[PDB]
Amino acid sequence: SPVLFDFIEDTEPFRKSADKALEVYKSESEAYASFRVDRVERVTRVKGGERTNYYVDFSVRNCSRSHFHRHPAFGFCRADLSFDVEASNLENPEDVIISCEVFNFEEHGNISGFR
Numbered sequence: 001s002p003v004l005f006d007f008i009e010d011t012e013p014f015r016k017s018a019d020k021a022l023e024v025y026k027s028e029s030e031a032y033a034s035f036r037v038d039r040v041e042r043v044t045r046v047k048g049g050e051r052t053n054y055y056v057d058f059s060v061r062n063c064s065r066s067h068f069h070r071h072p073a074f075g076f077c078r079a080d081l082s083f084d085v086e087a088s089n090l091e092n093p094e095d096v097i098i099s100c101e102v103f104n105f106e107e108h109g110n111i112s113g114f115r
């Protein structure tokens with residue numbers, strides 16, 4: 001059985017999947033409580049003998065940093081959605097694995113300095 005790796009060009013149908021994966025992620029990681037999906041960036045499909053996996057790569061924002069003129073923040077997440085090969089839509093993955101990494105304006109280089 002060959003394994004097929006390719007990309008889905010129309011990512012908008014994965015937006016809800018990204019929203020829900022972030023919701024799940026933040027329920028386990030309290031520092032992420034204020035976070036919201038920015039854009040779905042890329043979706044990769046891997047089709048195997050057993051499952052179809054979709055890897056939904058998405059940007060996030062730390063909305064608590066939109067208040068009080070805080071330092072900006074951004075993150076990238078990947079959600080791995082694993083589907084029964086018989087699934088007819090995206091709504092009900094058998095399981096989901098999510099990781100996220102954050103990029104804080106003030107923790108990198110000299111960009112948070114003054115003249």
Ligand SMILES: *[C@@H]1O[C@H](CO)[C@@H](O[C@@H]2O[C@H](CO)[C@@H](O[C@@H]3O[C@H](CO)[C@@H](O)[C@H](O)[C@@H]3O)[C@H](O)[C@H]2NC(C)=O)[C@H](O)[C@H]1NC(C)=O
Pocket residue numbers: 031032062064065070073102
């Ligand atoms: C998203 O943005 C918010 C705001 O920057 C981040 O929450 C803040 O996280 C810092 C570091 O944990 C908190 O500071 C800590 O405060 C505790 C108690 O005050 C103190 O014991 C620690 O030494 C530390 O200074 C800060 O309170 C918290 N701020 C707010 C307003 O909630 C959050 O971490 C960012 N999320 C992620 C995933 O990066």
Ligand SMILES: *SC[C@H](NC(=O)CC[C@H](N)C(=O)O)C(=O)NCC(=O)O
Pocket residue numbers: 036037038061062063064066
């Ligand atoms: S993180 C602050 C909120 N952002 C969003 O809800 C979506 C992400 C985008 N970066 C965007 O909105 O441009 C927010 O509260 N946005 C403005 C509002 O008051 O709705």
